[PDB]
């Protein structure tokens, strides 16, 4: 039992837009979705739902502005005409008692800007703990995705949250925290994904002499 | 010793107003910074509506005040504003403390001087009453609605609702005291009649004051109506009854308006000498309308945040009651004298003698 | 083995203009295919059908169905629901019953208060009018 | 009339080992029908308690729903590292007709022992001032409380409206934080001045740590 939502992009205010969140391991006529969405950094704000009759029930403030269907497998949520307000991770969620199996959630942007590509520079380590990481800056929209060693270091790594600057782009960076000894020794390098821009980057965060 | 008793009891009434008042702000600003907007302005126009009608009691007072007063350094035309500036009880406080402590100073000044101080004394105590019925009950019942409705009771509220206790203690022991000093030849220990008179009316005010408290919290939208309706028809009974406290007959509309506040809390008699038909009267008026406040909040039960206990604080109510009506009968059936019938304060007489009959 | 179904709340109390939700849940395994909503009345059970009257629904998942009433009625609705649950092993009924309280119960803080303050009205107007 | 549902506190603090509790408020009668959320930063929520106090699947019994009608609270105890998150309620009574909005939220900060903030700092890296934009990082790490000032001083001059921070949630693990202060410049304004630091001042630091750097050096 899991389901995963699909169709986050950047869109232009009032461009319609469809979003897809697709079930697995249930059927979609034994149990109703729902459709919830979150502004960056706010609380949740319950959209609609769809029974498992087929009945639709919207919230009073977004009545006219969304739209949800269903196939057999998959529930579609439609943004008649998006608004900068409208920028939010959509989640989708199976409706028992209250939700209990939630989506990853997709992202909506709205705005005029266009999409950008992001520039990574190395935070060179210091010169018993060493700390190194690579600076994500100038990128936009959101998300980034950050890993290190293709996801082999984990412990002591801290991803910021971006956020926005003058130019309005979107900026950030991943530190991490190693032993000094292994400077020398192991090789450290960030990998950044930005899906929007579709750039893998694989930048090297080499010391300085 | 009299004079020492007199201006420390009266730096200490003083001192309780200047503490209520200030706990008061206190509660409002901290309202104000932490959230709602709504609680901080009800209880600013309420300050404001008390403070108003202060002022222009003493101010009226002053206007029909005869040849006397001179020692007021400011002048007349700086008087008025001094009032309008919400500074005319600050100004007889000061008055009545700077003119007691020039008495005890002087070795023995004359007769004269002594009977302004006390003049003075007697004034500040008959305002002391009316700001308390105006604003102390108001404000301890608009504090407890507050703290049952949000649920979430804080250290200055619980000493702003102490502050308000002491408060109305000082004020009905000061009333008590200075109308059974207007009347001649002071034969019983009145202390003792002064502390049971306050006892009894103080345990039968708290419990109106919670189901007032009760009724604001279950309903906000409905206090307004229910206290204008209650509030019009005792005004409707105070202008079929007779009045003539203060000698503007036009400006008794504010003698009128705060003795129906005042009775829309408690008892306090009104004129002519007949007893225990209008007192009856108005305990059946008072009785009823706690009863019903109580049984609409039994009936909306689950309807606020579990806070201060009601199953606690109920029961003391309803003994605090039953005790005051006891102590109540005791001091008017037995302990009650009335003795029948230089400036001399005519409206200390005035309601000594509407409130000593025989 | 058989099912065994119990509501939520076996006892509730609504009133009028409002939407009741009964709901009714069952853990037995196999879980609870079907469910079906009854309306008892004097010798004999009425079915619910989803969309009588355009206000009654009934929303049913694995083990568990919701029966929605819109518009409280005062004279039908009020009364002793029965739902049963029928796995592949039987089948299981649990009994909830619905009040409906009115406006006559609702407002009761504004015909009372305005009764009390008719009869001080009254009272003082012939205590001191006439009587004085 | 969709129901609106009144979270209250917007926030609330307990030590390692305590308890807290959260009130919910429902515009009408929604009797027995209130959820309990967790969210942490950047996961979805998940379920945590149903029908008001039936506790959902694989959650620990330190979570206890209670209440009805109209008041509901959460409540728990033997609060650990891996408690902090935001809190979200959710009525579910006749959606048909008053919808399921959510409530405000509740962030629990967990209150652990001080930890005084380990300071580094990084200068620009040569490929960013080929792009033509220098960017200094001041990083404060594994500290609380979360209350910290930074301070960018430049040639002891002290800036300000030229650096963004960034402060990342309270770690699952030991409660702690980390915070990072990016001052932003020109090529021009870079090769200017001369010496940068980062004056930290934070409650378990006993005197200012100040963190500093010359360029080229
Ligand atoms: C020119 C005319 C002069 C005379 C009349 C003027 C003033 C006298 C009366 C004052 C009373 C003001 C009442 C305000 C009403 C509007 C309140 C409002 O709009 O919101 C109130 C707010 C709501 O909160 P909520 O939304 O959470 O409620 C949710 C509730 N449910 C859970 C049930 C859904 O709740 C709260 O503030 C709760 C606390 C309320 C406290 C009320 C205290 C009343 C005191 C009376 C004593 C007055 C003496 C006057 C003497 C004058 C002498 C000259």
Same mark, same amino acid.
């Given at each position: 039992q899991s389901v995963e939502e699909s169709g986050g992009r950047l869109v232009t205010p009032g461009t319609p837009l469809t979003l897809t969140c697709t079930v697995s391991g249930?059927?979609?006529?034994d149990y109703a979705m729902n459709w919830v969405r979150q502004a960056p950094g706010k609380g949740l704000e319950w959209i609609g739902i769809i029974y498992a009759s087929g009945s639709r029930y919207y919230a009073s403030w977004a009545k006219g502005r969304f739209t949800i269907s269903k196939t057999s497998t998959t529930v579609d949520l439609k943004i008649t005409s998006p608004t900068t307000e409208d920028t939010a991770t959509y989640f989708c969620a199976r409706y028992?008692?209250?939700?209990?199996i939630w989506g990853p959630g997709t992202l909506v942007t709205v705005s005029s800007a266009s999409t950008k590509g992001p520039s990574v520079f190395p935070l060179a380590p210091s010169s018993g703990t060493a700390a190194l990481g690579c600076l994500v800056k100038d990128y936009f929209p959101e998300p980034v995705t950050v890993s290190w060693n293709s996801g082999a270091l984990t412990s002591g790594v801290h991803t910021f949250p971006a956020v926005l600057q003058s130019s309005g782009l979107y900026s950030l960076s991943s530190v991490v925290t190693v032993p000094?000894?292994?400077?020398?020794?192991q090789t450290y390098i960030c990998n950044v994904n930005h899906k929007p821009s579709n750039t893998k980057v694989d930048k090297k965060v080499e010391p300085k002499s | 010793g009299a004079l020492l008793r007199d201006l420390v009891l009266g730096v200490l009434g003083t001192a309780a107003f200047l503490l209520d008042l200030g706990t008061d702000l206190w509660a409002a600003v901290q309202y104000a910074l932490g959230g709602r907007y709504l609680w901080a302005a009800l209880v600013l126009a309420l300050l404001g509506l008390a403070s108003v009608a202060l002022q222009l009691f003493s101010w009226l007072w002053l206007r029909a005040?005869?040849?006397?007063?001179?020692?007021?350094?400011?002048?007349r035309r700086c008087l008025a504003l001094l009032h309008l500036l919400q500074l005319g009880y600050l100004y007889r406080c000061v008055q009545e403390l700077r003119q007691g402590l020039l008495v005890w100073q002087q070795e023995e000044p004359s007769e004269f001087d002594l009977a302004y101080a006390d003049f003075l004394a007697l004034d500040i105590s008959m305002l002391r009453l009316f700001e308390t019925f105006l604003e102390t009950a108001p404000q301890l019942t608009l504090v407890l609605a507050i703290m049952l409705q949000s649920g979430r009771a804080e250290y200055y509220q619980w000493v702003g609702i102490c502050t308000s206790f002491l408060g109305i203690s000082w004020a009905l022991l000061d009333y008590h005291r200075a109308l059974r000093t207007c009347?001649?030849?002071?034969?019983?220990l009145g202390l003792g009649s002064s502390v049971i008179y306050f006892l009894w009316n103080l345990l039968l005010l708290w419990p109106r004051v919670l189901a007032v408290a009760l009724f604001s919290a279950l309903f906000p939208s409905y206090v307004a109506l229910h206290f204008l309706g209650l509030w019009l028809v005792l005004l409707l009974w105070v202008w079929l009854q007779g009045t003539?406290?203060?000698?503007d007959p036009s400006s008794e509309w504010l003698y009128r308006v705060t003795v129906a506040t005042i009775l829309y809390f408690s008892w306090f008699n009104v004129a002519?000498?007949?007893?225990?038909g209008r007192a009856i009267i108005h305990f059946a008026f008072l009785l009823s309308d706690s009863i019903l406040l109580v049984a609409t909040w039994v009936t909306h039960?689950?309807?606020?945040?579990?806070?201060?206990?009601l199953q606690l604080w109920l029961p003391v109510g309803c003994g605090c009651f039953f005790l005051g009506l006891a102590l109540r009968l005791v001091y008017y059936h037995w302990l009650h004298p009335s003795c029948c019938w230089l400036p001399q304060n005519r409206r200390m007489t005035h309601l000594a003698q509407k409130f000593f009959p025989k | 083995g058989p099912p065994r179904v119990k509501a939520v709340k076996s006892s509730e109390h609504i009133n009028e203009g409002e939407t009741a939700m009964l709901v009714c849940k069952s853990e037995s395994?196999?879980?609870?295919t079907d469910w079906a909503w009854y309306k008892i009345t004097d010798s004999e059970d009425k079915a619910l059908m989803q969309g009588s009257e355009s206000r009654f629904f009934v929303s049913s998942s694995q083990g568990r169905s919701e029966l929605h009433i819109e518009?409280?009625?005062?004279?039908?609705?009020?009364g002793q629901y029965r739902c049963q649950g029928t796995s592949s092993k039987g089948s299981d009924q649990a009994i909830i019953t619905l009040r409906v309280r009115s406006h006559l119960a609702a407002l009761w803080p504004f015909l009372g208060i305005v009764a009390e303050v008719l009869v001080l009205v009254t009272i003082i107007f012939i205590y001191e009018k006439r009587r004085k | 009339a969709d129901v609106v549902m009144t979270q209250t506190p917007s926030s609330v603090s307990a030590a390692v080992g305590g308890t807290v509790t959260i009130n919910c408020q429902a515009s009408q009668s929604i009797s027995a029908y209130l959820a309990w959320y967790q969210q942490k930063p950047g996961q979805p929520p998940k379920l945590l308690i149903?029908? !008001?106090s039936d506790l959902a699947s694989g959650?620990?019994?330190?979570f206890k729903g209670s209440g009805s009608g109209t008041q509901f609270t959460l409540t728990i105890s033997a609060?650990?590292? !891996?408690?902090?998150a935001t809190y979200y309620c959710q009525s579910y009574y006749a959606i048909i007709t008053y919808g399921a909005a959510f409530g405000g939220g509740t962030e629990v900060v967990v209150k652990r022992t001080v930890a005084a903030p380990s300071v580094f700092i990084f200068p620009p890296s040569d490929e960013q001032l080929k792009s033509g934009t220098a960017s200094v990082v001041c990083l404060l790490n594994?500290?609380?409380?979360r209350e910290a000032k930074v301070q960018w001083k430049v040639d002891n001059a002290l800036q300000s409206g030229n650096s963004q921070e960034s402060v990342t949630e309270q770690?699952?693990?030991?409660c702690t934080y980390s915070l990072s202060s990016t001052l932003t410049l020109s090529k021009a304004d870079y090769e200017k001045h001369k010496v940068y630091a980062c004056e930290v001042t934070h409650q378990g630091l006993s005197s200012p740590v100040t963190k500093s750097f010359n360029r080229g050096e």
């Open positions: 249930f059927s979609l006529s028992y008692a209250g939700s209990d000094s000894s292994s400077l020398g020794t | 005040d005869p040849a006397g007063l001179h020692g007021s350094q400011p002048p009347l001649p030849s002071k034969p019983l003539d406290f203060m000698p002519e000498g007949r007893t225990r039960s689950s309807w606020l945040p579990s806070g201060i206990p | 395994v196999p879980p609870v518009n409280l009625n005062m004279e039908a609705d009020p | 149903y029908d !008001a959650v620990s019994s330190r609060l650990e590292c !891996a408690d902090a594994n500290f609380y409380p770690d699952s693990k030991d």
